[PDB]
């Protein structure tokens, strides 16, 4: 999902449905290869010791001036018009150049 | 003439710095509801003697 050949935009993004697999976050949290690392809601240590229901992977490419709006409780040209996260967002945002 | 494009295009150049660099954003969404928790990793790493 990070080294994908093709992708979509920030408003017509393809939701990569992830199901029936073990989500190992050890190769993504402490890999020292992702520049933007935002987390909201809860700590990322609880994302590996507590089970959740639905996990979706929204893969899109956006610039750094509009990557700050992908957060609960923001505004702008993306957080109100293109892609908005819910207020009860207990996930993380991982991106790389 | 009278053909405006509100869907403006992005700009990605190698000469730009970290401000306009392409970020492969993958949003890790999580949600808890009345449905049983299924996809967060059903098993973990343990040990045995």
């Amino acid at each position: 999902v990070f080294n994908a050949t093709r992708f979509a935009s920030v408003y017509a993004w393809n939701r990569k449905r992830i199901s029936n697999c073990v989500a190992d976050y050890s190769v993504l949290y402490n890999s020292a290869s992702f520049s933007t690392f935002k987390c909201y809601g809860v700590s990322p240590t609880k994302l590996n010791d507590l089970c959740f229901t639905n996990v979706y992977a929204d893969s899109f490419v956006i610039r750094g001036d509009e990557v700050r709006q992908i957060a609960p409780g923001q505004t702008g040209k993306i957080a109100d018009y293109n892609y908005k996260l819910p207020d009860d967002f207990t996930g993380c945002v991982i991106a790389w150049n | 003439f009278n053909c405006y494009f509100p869907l403006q295009s992005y700009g990605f150049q190698p000469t730009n710095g970290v401000g306009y660099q392409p970020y492969r954003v993958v949003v890790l969404s999580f949600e808890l509801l009345h449905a049983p928790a299924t996809v967060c990793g059903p098993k973990k790493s343990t040990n045995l003697v």
Partner: antibody, heavy 118, light 108 residues
Framework: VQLQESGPSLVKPSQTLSLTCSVT????????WNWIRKFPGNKLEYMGY???????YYSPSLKSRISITRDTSKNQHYLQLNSVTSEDTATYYC?????????????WGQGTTLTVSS | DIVMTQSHKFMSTSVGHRVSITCKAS??????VAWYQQKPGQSPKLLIY???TRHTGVPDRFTGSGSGTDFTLTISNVQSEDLADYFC?????????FGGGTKLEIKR
């Protein structure tokens, strides 16, 4: 490459802010040159940045009263803030936000202390 | 904002003593923790990127470690000319939130 800060240090409230930062040793062709102000007491706050193409973006602390311009002919860039008050009394610094060889480098300048009061 | 709250504001380190500056983050920022170096009479420059890799032109006596939330700077065999201010900040997204800072002193 050494950065040098300049500009006026006496700006009355409800006026137009104007600063000038000069870059010696590298033209405005690659990277970013941002604005970071310094409050008395080791308190730093981000203001904005601009590339060499002309497009800029503002900090979420201010809503719409900050505009950042650049100049590739004189290798300088300006900062403009409208409707200033006593909260803008800080020492503005200029940096160099550029990357290279899968790493990030940054260096600041001398800074110019600006006082907005009566 | 993710404020990089430091644990100590000052530390007495002699020539050759190991510097240990610990900054506690309220939110996990991964590994995008950088350090500054504000010398008296010089310009503040970035020293350590990704909490382990030094800046170009700087000798290998400045290094460190850290993972997730507990980031601790480790300067082995420091000298008297390295008396500067070390700040804790982030570079993952805009705006860049800065902390208080730690000023070193030569133990005499």
């Amino acid at each position: 490459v050494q950065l040098q800060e300049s500009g006026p240090s006496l700006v009355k409230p409800s006026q137009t802010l104007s600063l000038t930062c000069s870059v010696t040793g590298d033209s405005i062709t690659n990277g970013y040159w941002n604005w970071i102000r310094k409050f008395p007491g080791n308190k730093l706050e981000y203001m904005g940045y601009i590339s060499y193409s002309g497009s800029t973006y503002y900090s979420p602390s201010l809503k719409s009263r900050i505009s950042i311009t650049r100049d590739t002919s004189k290798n300088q860039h300006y900062l403009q803030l409208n409707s200033v008050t006593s909260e803008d009394t800080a020492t503005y610094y200029c940096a160099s936000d550029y990357h290279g060889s899968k790493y990030y480098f940054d260096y600041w300048g001398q800074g110019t202390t600006l006082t907005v009061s009566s | 904002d993710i404020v990089m709250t430091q644990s100590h504001k000052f530390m007495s380190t002699s020539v050759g003593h190991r510097v240990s500056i610990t900054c506690k983050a309220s939110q996990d920022v991964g590994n995008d923790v950088a350090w500054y170096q504000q010398k008296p009479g010089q310009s503040p420059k970035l020293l350590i990127y990704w909490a382990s890799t030094r800046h170009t032109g700087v000798p290998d006596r400045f290094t460190g470690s850290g993972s997730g939330t507990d980031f601790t700077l480790t300067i082995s065999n420091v000298q008297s000319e390295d008396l500067a201010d070390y700040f804790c900040q982030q570079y993952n997204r805009y705006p860049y939130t800065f902390g208080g800072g730690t000023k070193l002193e030569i133990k005499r």
